[PDB]
């Protein structure tokens with residue numbers, strides 16, 4: 283792992299803020315001599331966080347090398363601040379893109395979905411769960427390539443971890459099975475596949491299904507026994523293969539829902555002519571209308 | 572029957588009792604008769620459904636169990652629900668033990684019996700308390716024991732808005748993930764565990780691991796070789812209290828005894844458990 287106990291503002295000039303909230307800030311940063319653009323995730327560290335196991339996640343991040351997951355370059359630890367230096371994806375998220383470009387073509391969506399599934403197939407074989415597949419978290423570089431973020435080690439510490447404890451409340455009276463669920467949730471690996479199903483509709487239609495309907499109402503509808511999963515609005519615009527991809531990804535029963543590996547042999551995503559050219563056309567549409 | 576009327580017409584709000592996520596709670600006097608009640612003010616927001624709200628209130632009205640705080644009525648003035656309830660004048664057992672110090676084994680056994688009677692009722696009504704602790708076991712001036720009810724108040728207002736904010740946008744969330752985000756791992760038998768820990772709390776002024784960080788406690792509890800808590804001072808307490816703690820604090824939920832099963836346990840089925848034990852406590856003040 284080797285977290286360098288040094289100020290990263292010495293080594294990179296922070297150009298521009300990209301986003302943040304609970305986890306911390308993410309900046310666009312230039313490598314001072316070499317001119318390489320990176321993403322610096324500044325994480326707020328707090329005194330009761332273990333530095334020993336923190337390095338073991340960073341060791342997993344270093345030894346990991348999958349193409350559809352954002353690359354880890356290195357760690358700095360200056361004044362109660364972990365800085366995770368990462369790959370920069372210069373076009374932003376697909377949300378940032380679609381809000382300017384409008385809806386993606388079926389081919390563009392098919393390529394995105396294949397690249398996400400390759401990322402999800404890798405994370406699940408490493409016993410991890412993404413937990414948050416949406417348009418806003420699928421990043422696009424200038425080459426038209428597709429990258430997932432990784433909120434793995436950032437979830438285990440800091441202000442996002444303190445947020446997850448604050449709603450849970452004092453744990454001292456809580457039973458073991460209640461505490462088990464308070465850590466995990468209902469999140470297993472296959473919920474990412476559902477979430478991709480919703481994402482593909484989002485990219486298709488500029489919104490996930492029920493986005494105009496109250497969050498609670500949606501939660502109750504989802505849980506009630508005869509909940510029909512969502513579908514694409516405009517049947518004729520999309521091919522049968524896209525409809526089937528949405529049907530099978532949005533299987534209600536987790537036991538019966540296909541895994542990332544199973545999904546990569548689906549017609550929509552195994553078809554030829556799916557490559558980054560499709561996204562270069564999209565990024566061109568962002569510049570030239 | 573939610574009365575579309577101002578409750579400040581019918582009651583004088585005397586004094587604030589505390590708290591504020593679930594709602595703010597005032598001690599209130601009935602204007603003519605002088606009867607004391609507890610009024611829980613909840614701040615409501617415009618997209619809260621009044622239809623199913625009445626069905627919980629209908630279950631609360633038709634309910635008449637003695638160990639659960641009694642529901643008197645609901646009032647709805649300007650985007651503010653006010654839930655009129657039974658008053659318990661001695662406060663919570665936490666408020667009490669912070670002045671009195673530790674309860675005797677007999678006092679604890681009486682509290683435990685009255686809570687289990689409440690929990691046996693709630694579980695037969697398919698509900699779960701979710702929050703059995705010293706601070707939520709109330710004591711009236713008669714020495715009697717009442718559980719609170721954060722049932723319908725959890726389904727609306729600022730506590731409902733908080734539960735949505737941490738869960739985050741549900742639109743991308745899978746059904747099984749949403750199911751767990753509503754329920755939790757709360758089943759009925761977690762209240763029995765929670766009472767087990769409450770009995771220790773009453774015994775020792777703190778739950779077990781109170782000086783250990785919340786996260787560390789959550790990870791310890793979940794890891795495979797987690798030993799449940801026990802009482803510190805073996806000699807001070809009887810074997811029956813130790814067994815009550817051992818069986819209530821069973822890790823495996825399938826093997827952990829229900830409220831009904833627990834009421835026929837030795838500690839709480841013994842004679843001489845009555846409100847006199849708590850009158851002695853309230854007298855120590």
Ligand SMILES: COc1cc2c(cc1Nc1ncc(C(N)=O)c(Nc3ccccc3Br)n1)CN(C)CC2
Nearest residue numbers: 300301302308321352368369370371372373374431
């Ligand atoms: C020109 O590059 C960008 C423009 C914009 C956005 C993102 C980028 N690039 C970008 N590249 C790489 C990463 C990375 N290694 O993780 C990243 N992370 C990130 C950013 C914001 C929040 C959380 C995270 Br995690 N972001 C995000 N949008 C919301 C506004 C525009």
Ligand SMILES: COc1cc2c(cc1Nc1ncc(C(N)=O)c(Nc3ccccc3Br)n1)CN(C)CC2
Nearest residue numbers: 588589590596609640656657658659660662663719
């Ligand atoms: C002299 O009576 C009291 C003194 C005090 C406390 C409680 C009481 N009595 C009391 N009786 C009944 C209820 C009820 N129908 O629910 C209640 N509600 C309540 C009050 C505060 C918070 C949450 C809730 Br629910 N409160 C609470 N303590 C923390 C500080 C002092």
